[PDB]
């Protein structure tokens, strides 16, 4: 369990109610009994959500942001804060969190290569399971959308009139 | 050369002037000395424009439309008429020509498979040389467009302010 002074300060510094902080601390200790989470465990957790990808790179980048004090461990105070900002923060706070994710070397700037590395990390993890933007208009999907819209009577055939009217 | 009665009727039945009909007849005989064009030559011509693709399927489908009387040859009267409609016809005429291309078995209807076959024929011919719709928003292009738009001072780096303002 969590001391009452700790629950009061954490509730104060985050967007969660006291009950929700205590429910998050339970889940933290359940899937992290030592009370401390290192990069290896972070990666293994992301591997449960994405078994068919390589979550190494992206998990490492996200671990960099969770680890506020950059000591190699994620204590609960860092765990809850990241969740509070990423899930219930203002747009400016979420964007600051995102800037930090994209700023891999933590020098205060995002380079083209850093941004490319993030997208490559995301693709390595989810590329082969989630629908991607470049797959929205593949040739077969284009044909299916045109033909469905032109086939007004849905008989599976296109008359010239359907083809002409549908072409406009 | 072309008889004056032939040039008068062809000019009448097409959108070309007499001089243009005679210039098209010259080009026809130059790249088709026998005065008759069969499927093999049609395919070989399309192969000159697309050496790295397989223009067989698409050339065959287009030859089907050129060959109005479906006798296996493209005479000049068919050659000039196809060009006149495809290049200078009304929208309704161009669409009728296109419907005929897409109607592979010439039964008056376009099925899903017929439309898919046309797109597959086009891809076999130009797929590996022309830019495709599904390639417009690939991950690298998305990154380049976001980063270029967010990098206002074009120094190659993104400050938090640039990232925030550009995110909106
Ligand atoms: C919908 C409910 O889950 C969420 N709500 C979120 C709100 C915002 C962000 C994230 C998110 O993705 O943060 C990044 C992230 O991703 C990832 O996989 O791990 C982490 C840390 C959220 N997650 C997903 C999540 C996954 C795992 C844990 C976790 C990690 C270590 C130890 C215990 C737990 C745990 N404690 O209680 C549990 O149920 N597990 C926590 C949260
Ligand atoms: C910009 C100038 O070319 C065009 N203007 C067009 C207007 C509308 C459509 C087409 C088009 O693509 O028709 C389908 C098509 O495609 C293809 O490759 O062959 C064909 C027949 C056009 N073409 C391209 C073209 C290519 C080859 C020939 C051709 C074929 C056989 C014998 C002689 C010639 C010839 N006679 O004079 C020449 O210069 N060549 C004719 C035209
Ligand atoms: Ca830490
Ligand atoms: Ca950086
Ligand atoms: Ca129909
Ligand atoms: Ca013919
Ligand atoms: Ca048909
Ligand atoms: Ca800049």
Residue numbers in the entry:
A (entry chain B), B (entry chain B): 7 to 174
What does the primary publication say about this deposited structure?
At the molecular level, NCS-1 contains two pairs of EF-hands and a C-terminal dynamic helical region that inserts into a surface exposed hydrophobic groove and acts as a ligand mimic in the absence of a binding partner. Neuronal calcium sensor 1 (NCS-1) interacts with D2R in a Ca2+-dependent manner.
Crystals were obtained for full-length NCS-1 in complex with ATV and NCS-1ΔH10 in complex with AZS and VLZ (see Experimental Section). The asymmetric unit contained a single molecule of NCS-1ΔH10. However, the 2Fo-Fc and the Fo-Fc electron density maps revealed domain swapping between EF-hand motifs, with two NCS-1 molecules exchanging their EF-hand EF-4. The resulting NCS-1 structure, comprising EF-hands 1 to 3 from one molecule and EF-hand 4 from a second molecule, closely resembles the canonical monomeric conformation in which EF-hands pair in a two-by-two arrangement without domain swapping. The interface between AZS and NCS-1 spans a contact area of 468.8 Å2, comprising 490 interactions, predominantly mediated by van der Waals forces. Ligand recognition involves 15 NCS-1 residues located within EF-hand 1 (helices H2 and H3) and EF-hand 2 (helices H4 and H5). Notably, all aromatic moieties of AZS, including the benzimidazole, two phenyl rings, oxadiazole, and dioxolane, engage in π-π stacking with surrounding aromatic residues.
